[PDB]
Amino acid sequence: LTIGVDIGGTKIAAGVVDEEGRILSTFKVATPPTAEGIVDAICAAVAGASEGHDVEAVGIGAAGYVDDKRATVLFAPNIDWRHEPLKDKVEQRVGLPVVVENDANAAAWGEYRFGAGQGHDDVICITLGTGLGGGIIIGNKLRRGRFGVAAEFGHIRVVPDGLLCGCGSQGCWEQYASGRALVRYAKQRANATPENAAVLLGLGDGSVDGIEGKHISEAARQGDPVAVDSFRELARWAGAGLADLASLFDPSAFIVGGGVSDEGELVLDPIRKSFRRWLIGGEWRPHAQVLAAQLGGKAGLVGAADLARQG
Amino acid sequence: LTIGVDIGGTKIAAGVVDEEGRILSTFKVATPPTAEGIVDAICAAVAGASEGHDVEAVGIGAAGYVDDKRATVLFAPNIDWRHEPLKDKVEQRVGLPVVVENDANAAAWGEYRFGAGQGHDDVICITLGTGLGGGIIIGNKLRRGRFGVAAEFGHIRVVPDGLLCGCGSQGCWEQYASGRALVRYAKQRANATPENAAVLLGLGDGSVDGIEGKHISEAARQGDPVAVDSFRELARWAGAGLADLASLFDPSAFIVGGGVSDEGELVLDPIRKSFRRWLIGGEWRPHAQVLAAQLGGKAGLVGAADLARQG
Amino acid sequence: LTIGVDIGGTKIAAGVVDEEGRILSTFKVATPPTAEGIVDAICAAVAGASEGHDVEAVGIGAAGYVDDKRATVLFAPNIDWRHEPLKDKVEQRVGLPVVVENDANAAAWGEYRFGAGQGHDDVICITLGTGLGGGIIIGNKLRRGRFGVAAEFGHIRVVPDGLLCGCGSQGCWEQYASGRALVRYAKQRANATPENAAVLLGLGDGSVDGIEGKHISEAARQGDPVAVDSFRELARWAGAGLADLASLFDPSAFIVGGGVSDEGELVLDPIRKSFRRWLIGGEWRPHAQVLAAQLGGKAGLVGAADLARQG
Amino acid sequence: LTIGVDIGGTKIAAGVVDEEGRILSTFKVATPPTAEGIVDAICAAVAGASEGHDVEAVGIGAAGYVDDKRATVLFAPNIDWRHEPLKDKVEQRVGLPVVVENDANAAAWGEYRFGAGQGHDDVICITLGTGLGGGIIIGNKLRRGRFGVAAEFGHIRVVPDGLLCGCGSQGCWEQYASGRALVRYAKQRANATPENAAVLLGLGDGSVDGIEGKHISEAARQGDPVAVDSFRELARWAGAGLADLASLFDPSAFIVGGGVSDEGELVLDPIRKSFRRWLIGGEWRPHAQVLAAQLGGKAGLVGAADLARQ
Ligand SMILES: [Zn+2]
Ligand SMILES: [Zn+2]
Ligand SMILES: [Zn+2]
Ligand SMILES: [Zn+2]
Asked: Of the residues A258, A310, C2, D116, which has the maximum number of CB atoms within 10 A of its CB?
């Protein structure tokens, strides 16, 4: 029995989780803008979620690069952590041992252990959020890398001299296949051909900026030409990438979750269909599966809890 | 005590390799023009290399996708081989256990176990030649992939819609970081500004296309502006690539070898400099060493012989 | 009243064309393998077509860089002409006044003066064949540029570090927007997803290699999915580019034509839809029309003739 | 005898320009925040400059898409203007006839008629500022295009699915060869190897983001390895471009001017050399000349002036 925490931009969330990934308790606080308030909000959230239960360790999913010690947040893009010991600060204050994991590595292990990855051995997970993140599992282990920063798939350059990424470099995959990307793609199309977007503009404020990640997903189901076109474009870079990861890792299966994948096979099919249409030498090689995530949002919590059991 | 085989375009070497990766007796045969005759020449070579030696097992470097069961060449670009059961074929006609490995994988592992990898756990190898290829070690074991076809690095797409590649896909990395690329960039630069290739051209037939691989590594070490600056361009693509593999697996070390690196730190240093510059991170995330391969060309032969002791 | 010449690769055709651009007599002659044999063959052609006809001039469509004096082929890619004085040669030997033009320019002028171009002042014609080619008409004149070599739209570099081109460069538009292109796209796709290209692979010989341009323009209208997707890919590069010519010259009408446009609204339409999708200034700038090319094959001859009317 | 006007984010300038492009007077008014106020400050500036002189017309340098009718500003990326009838509004409030030109096109014509274009026919002008803009001259006539929005070189896509542009499409040339681009390249390379940028970080504030356009040109003329390498990187894209315009227009000359070129052959020689390294089939074809722009900052103003006489 253990507790996991997903540190998710709007809300932090803690929970007591059994050996089969069942949430016995949830508790949530509004994420702080500050640096040190996160530690304070985390313990607050641990102490709320423990709720009488006899807890052994605590695993935290932080959105940022976490080290190979599973101890420190090396760098987050938003929140100012400079080599900040998060294990050390929280261990001394909730008494119990702590382990810190990359946010998506948590999700990755979450889906693999209790989700769509059950009964596979070699598995790559992607998540399509505002950005694009993931994790590896090879041989039944999470693979952090030697320094702890492995599978930062979002910043594999896809387009040289590409778009400015939120990380510094240009052309990162995260700027072409993601929730950010999707919206760019809508707006671009939307601006040129306003007519073939009457159902999609009719959802926001009517004007070319009122477009949001939700508006597209729905506007597409009702087949709004521009909406569905923006999924193709996404599906493209999405699939391209999967094919590149397929060339490098050759998994049994990719497991695509994310906010924009909790939409279903409106998105998942085109990407599976792009992947196939972009994989190399498929004639001779086995095609990996492109499965969707089962645990949706919960992944990282459960992932983190169970990752807090490993040595 | 075990034999390794390296199936070269010109010639097929079969050597006896000991526990410590030491070639005790190489033996050679010419590479016939047929597909089916190669299987004879492999046996012919394993015959003669094996004279008066207590041999246990035999590994084969295959220039194509090898499966996970390590027994068939699924597809080779230059040998007419399709689902060709090289293992069963040779196992039957030599009388000793056989494994078949990807040629890139053998050399990757050969370097990891007896070469430049010693004392590392997570390692990614590249070798630059006509092409680009390599292998992966994560946690002390070669990682072939779920289906046996991993680390086909050569073909991670680096330019969308880019240069035509021999795997039939546009924009692979092989096309930009490889002896073949090196040459292209020289031919372009030399043709733009002939005045700076006073030395480089003099080495070939004084002509526009005379340039060949060797002539550049010669012209470079002789401080020739075009030949030194072609290596700068090969560095950009080579490094930028490693920086991306650094995001995927984030190893403790890249090991960079093959024909193009035989020329030494003239080639490797500007790469190491490119790698550092393209690396996503900054001064928080630590850098993976870029080491020179030690076992030169014998990598494939040696490493194959060791992969013959696995399971 | 005047004769034009279409220097076809398998025959040479001289034609008598009136003030209203309608062909009277037409005399063809085998294309010889020798360079000056084409001169000889042009003169024979000219003679044979000028039967009891009051002929004033002879315009000649040459597929090379013609100069500003409309006289020398400065370079033909196939014919061995370097600085050939084709105007003075052919004048001397047939007694009539002569003028030489780029073959795309003849096509361009023909279509502006006798096709989709009528009632427009500023117009840009693109003809999609093995390559791309075109011509500028601005202020009702053809615009050869200072040195003669205007309008080589084929080789304006759309993908830096892209595809090696006949012109000797990488990433030229020609390689992305043309027959040669469409076919890549089909082959890449068909080999990726055999299942979907079942009609396309029928029309040829079963195999990926057996695919040919005309088989796709058919397999499309029967709605073969691979063959349509390949027409999307083309329409993307063709429109993307048109929208760049639109930002350069800002014409009243583009006129897309030549081999893979004479197929019709199967193609023009997606292009027209892809030009609007990529045009910048959606809501403010009027949209230039995308018209289909009325004269088909004929144009080169008809334009050459009529360009002979002035200087 | 006529009046040109130059509408610039900091100041508007309206001068009197004779037959040979010579400025005889110059008046200036600070540029107000409203769209509806620029209208007035322009009237103010023409009234201020037409002192004593017999002016026959006004030409106006609009920083935005102007139409074929030389009368409307269809959209400006800064000035809040949509289908603004600037010609009519001004004509009626000064009493002299007015024409409204694209600002790049004003500049082009000025340079072609009075500066480095002297004695050419087919000529393409590029000005290299915060962004890249320009104008096309073919057969001694500025070419505005069918709808007047022609010549907009800045936004030919050089890198597909590339950098975000201020027109909202990705990849535009403006994002790769321009004052802004120059800044980015400087920053990137000094962040990559600060040791070769000691001289340049000095001129700024020791710090990677304190880098600005002026700082770099000075750092290069003191041979600062990074400032130079960042004009190499500007040259690469600047020529590649000029090379593709060579392919389209084949002019007798490109005239490269504006903010970044103010620095001279330290910038143009890299470019002039890149243009050659990217020109298609340049042993058969004749090469266009790359020439330094003569009239510097004034071109737009002189240009607008003469464009009021065509
Ligand atoms: Zn990034
Ligand atoms: Zn490839
Ligand atoms: Zn070309
Ligand atoms: Zn733009």
From this structure: A258
